[PDB]
Structures are given as C-alpha cells and as structure tokens.
Design a binder for this molecule. Structure first.
Ligand SMILES: CCCCCCC[C@H](CC(=O)O)NCC(=O)O
Ligand SMILES: CCCCCCC[C@H](CC(=O)O)NCC(=O)O
Ligand SMILES: [Fe+2]
Ligand SMILES: [Fe+2]
Lengths: 284, 285
C-alpha cells in the first residue's frame, strides 16, 4: 500500500524512510520479499536503531550466536568489515544459507552496506527453486523424501579469545556448540509452496533415505553440480549478481536463495529474522 | 569395536547386538554409542527377560523402580508398562519427563523393549534439551544460568491397588514422605559430552530461584518452557523427534539430554534403567 516495487524478481527495487512504524506493515513487506525473493530497499540511510526497527517489523530478530560478530552497541547486528575491531572480516566467502546449520534457520536476511569500495563488490545469489525446476524427474525423484546432513564445524572461524588454546579444545567446544544438523533434502516453502533443493556445496556432507541408509553418494554430487554452486567462474545461468550500494538495503528470502560474497574498506550490517512459519520448510 | 551403527543422531540403528553373545559388547563401546547419538535402536534383538538384564548390566548399574507395582512378576529390575491385566501398570509416561528426574540419582540411560505393539503409530516422542538450549539467544539464556529449579512429582504418583479404601490424605502424606520435591540446577552440563542442557519439565518443574533463594520472575520459567516445545499440544515442534516402537527393537537413550513422553490393541514394554557413575544429572552451569 505504502511501498512501490519497480520490476519483478531478483533485485526488484523498492521506493522506505526511517519513519516506518507507520504505514509499513509486516504483511506488506513480507509479501514483497516472498514474491520477488530478493529486493533492494532504495536509498534508506537508516541509523543502527532505525535498521533494527525495520527488522522488528519484518519479524523476530535473532542475534548471531557468536558475539565477536556483534556490533559494538547492538547484539542484533552482525558486522562484516575490513576495519580492525569492527565485527569480522571476510564473512560468507562460500555458498551458504544463513543459519542453515541451526535449529531455526532464518526466514529473511537483510544487509545494509555502510561503506563499499568501488562498484564490483556484492553478493551472488542462486535460486534453489529454479535449480529444482530445471532438474529432470530422473535426477529429481531420488532426492525426494531424503535427509541431508549439514556440517558447519570446519567453517567456524577462530576467535580472538581462542589464541593460545590447543586446537583440540577449540574443536571440542565447536562440536558441543554447533553439531551437524539434518534437514529434508527437498523442502516445500511454507508460504509460497515452492519446492527447494536445500543443499550447500560447503556444508552438505551426505544424503540418507528415510530409514538411515546411505544414498548413492553420486546423487549428492550430481545435485550439487546442477545448482551451479561448483562453477568457479560464477557464470551459471542460475547465478544472480547483486552489487552493493551504500545505503541500499538488500533484503531476501533465506529459504529459497543460496548466497556467497562477491570478492578498499568494506563494512556491512546485517539483521536476520524469523517469520513464525515452519523453518526451513516442510519435507518434500 | 564389535558393533556397527547405521546413521547418526536420534534413531540411529545398531546391528551387532546378539542375545546369546552379549559379553562381546564392552561397556565403553556401547556407552560411547549412546552418548554420541543420544537415541539408538538395537535392531532385531529379541532377548529373553534374563538376557535383557545382562544387556542392562553391561550398560551400567541397573536401578529397579522404587515402586514395586511396576515390577515384572519375576524380575524387580524391569519396569513393566502394559495394557494387560496384572502386568505392571497401564498408561505410563503420558507426559513429558526424564526418568527419575525427581530422585536423588537420575538415570544416565533408559532402555525399552517392546514385546507387543498394536499398529505402527505407537512409540515415544523425544526432545533434545541440548538442541533447545542451542536455539536460545543469550538474552533468554543468561538469566537461566546458575539458577535452581524445583521439580515436584507428587501429583503424578499413581494410585496403587494397595491404596484402595485409604483416605486420600494418608496416601498423599505417604507420597510426601517418600518422594518429596527436589532441586537441580536449571541449566546442567553433561559430565561426559560437556553439552549444556535445559533441565526443565513442563509437568514437574514448578519454580526457579537464584542461588540465594530469591524467586526468579515466573515469566522466565514460562518462556524457557515454551521454547522447549513441550507445550505444543500437537507435537509439531522442530525439537520433537518421533520414535515408533517395533517388537524386538530395543530403544536405548541418554536420559540426561532427552526429555520424552508416550505417543498414543495390546501394548507391552519392558524397561531397564542404569547409572553410569558420572555426576547425575550433571554439573551446574
Ligand atoms: C554450513 C555452511 C557453513 C556455515 C558457516 C558458519 C559461519 C558463518 C559466519 C561467517 O561467514 O564468518 N555463519 C553465518 C550464518 O550462518 O548466518
Ligand atoms: C517430574 C514428573 C515425575 C512423574 C513420574 C512419576 C511416575 C512415573 C511412572 C509412571 O508414569 O507411571 N515415573 C517414571 C520414572 O521417573 O522413571
Ligand atoms: Fe550470509
Ligand atoms: Fe519414561
């Protein structure tokens, strides 16, 4: 009602002012994200506090479990920056879905770039619903009704507090804190009803059937090949590029898109929200 | 060394359990399997009452249930849950609970053998309390640390046949002498795996206090309980694992980290519960 959408689909432009508790309703902005999957909230130059207000409208904000990622003044904000003492450098250099490995993966991720060097820095996205669409049934039907294991443990980053600890003690703590997790390999989006190939080049280790039996490991390899996630040059037709622009908030559906960083001083703030629907989705 | 595990995590399947060659299994082997996966199925072992006990004693020190009306006719060690006349007690565990959570030494391991199951929709729900804790933001989490929770079983003690015609006040008074309320730290650290466990029970945990006796805001217990999934009357929480009974398949699990309840012909199960000599239920966190 209050927001105007230019375009349709990945990258649609939305024309949001820091006084948003007014006409911006939660159902308005959700239906926009569900519909287009990735949108840009144009030229919002919000303050940290206003960002959070926008996040809370979108849904229930979840702070990142690991506090070295937290903004100095707000636990809610996950900070990626090249600048010493501001969050963590070089986050997300690998395909992933946010909190794909936690008990409640997010419904929405939102990124505000506060400082970008140049015009070629941003994020790659892959539509896992489209990837699924292009799959012939002969490759498709072995994935249905199977269970995928997602293992984050090797990607947990060493923290400043970890220096001089024996690596085995750090690993042991990781293993207690974020063990591998299982999700259905194919899920059905609780809102749109689309079927989603919920697998990740970096994190998905193996597929098993509904009785524990190991699926032919070339199935996982073949599905992963068809997502485009293994193309080291990033030319797959399934790969959308979204370039960062300062003050342009990138907001997207974290069930249906897989993403990774594309690549001066870079600094971005991030908020992640739940939507109260089945996460990541129903088994398909 | 002698056993092979299919899968990993809740419901993993174990194949090398031979009723006649049970002494092939070392204690450390089968313990590390249970600690690691939390819930396992020992497949197609159709043991005799006597062999079940042997399996139990390999696992650890068997503790018979304090109340004898639950006992197997011939073996005190075995807790009998059955729909059938004169066999143990009907309709046990129809509520979320940890076994002997209310006693001075809660079990490390619970083991169940189904002898007769009607259909395919009967079994046990499990909730991984380490996972529940994992999903809690610190803002909800840190007020629970270092607190003490009261667990009160008295209203759930079942009327026994010996109790008929007694005035209810005398029965209650005896319950109150026998199983009073007990206190455990609200957040526990598993003495073996080291995981932190939200050790609270919808039916049994009445109140939280700090380590000076002061009552914590009752909203804290209420909101921790909501986040466990135990209050979802339709059992659709992502934290809820379903395990269906199969005759001859022994379900064996870590009674520190899982909270469980019954998922509702003739049903008859045998149960054995063991200590492991480690701090029970765990260290305070
Ligand atoms: C299972 C796939 C890999 C998990 C990566 C975990 C570290 C990252 C943060 C970073 O890249 O430093 N997690 C961010 C999130 O999941 O939201
Ligand atoms: C804190 C809640 C305690 C209630 C359990 C008391 C009866 C049950 C047996 C039954 O359900 O009839 N005790 C089983 C056990 O603790 O092992
Ligand atoms: Fe990310
Ligand atoms: Fe029980």
């Amino acid at each position: 009602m209050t927001l105007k959408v230019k375009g349709e689909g990945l990258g649609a432009q939305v024309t949001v002012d820091p006084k948003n508790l007014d006409d911006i309703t939660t159902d308005e902005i959700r239906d926009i994200v569900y519909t287009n999957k990735l949108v840009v909230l144009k030229d919002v130059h919000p303050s940290p506090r206003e960002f959070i207000k926008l996040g809370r409208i979108i849904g229930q904000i979840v702070p990142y479990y690991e506090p070295m990622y937290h903004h100095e003044d707000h636990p809610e904000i996950f900070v990626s920056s090249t600048e010493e003492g501001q969050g963590v450098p070089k986050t997300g250099a690998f395909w992933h879905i946010d909190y794909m490995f936690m008990p409640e993966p997010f419904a929405f991720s939102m990124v505000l770039p506060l400082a970008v060097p140049g015009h070629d820095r941003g994020t790659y996205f892959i539509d896992l619903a489209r990837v699924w669409q292009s799959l012939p049934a002969a490759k498709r039907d072995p994935a249905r009704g199977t269970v995928s294991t997602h293992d984050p443990r090797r990607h947990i980053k060493i923290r400043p507090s970890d220096v001089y600890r024996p690596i085995g003690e750090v690993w042991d703590e990781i293993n207690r804190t974020t063990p591998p997790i299982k999700w259905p390999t194919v899920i059905r989006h609780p809102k749109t009803g689309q079927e989603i190939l919920y697998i990740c080049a970096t994190g998905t280790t193996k597929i098993e059937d509904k009785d524990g039996n190991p699926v032919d490991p070339e199935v996982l390899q073949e599905l992963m090949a068809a997502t485009g996630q293994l193309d080291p040059e990033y030319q797959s037709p399934f790969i959308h590029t979204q370039h960062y622009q300062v003050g342009d908030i990138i907001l997207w559906d974290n069930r249906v898109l897989m993403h990774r960083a594309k690549h001066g001083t870079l600094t971005t703030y991030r908020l992640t929200m739940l939507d109260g629907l089945k996460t990541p989705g129903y088994a398909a």
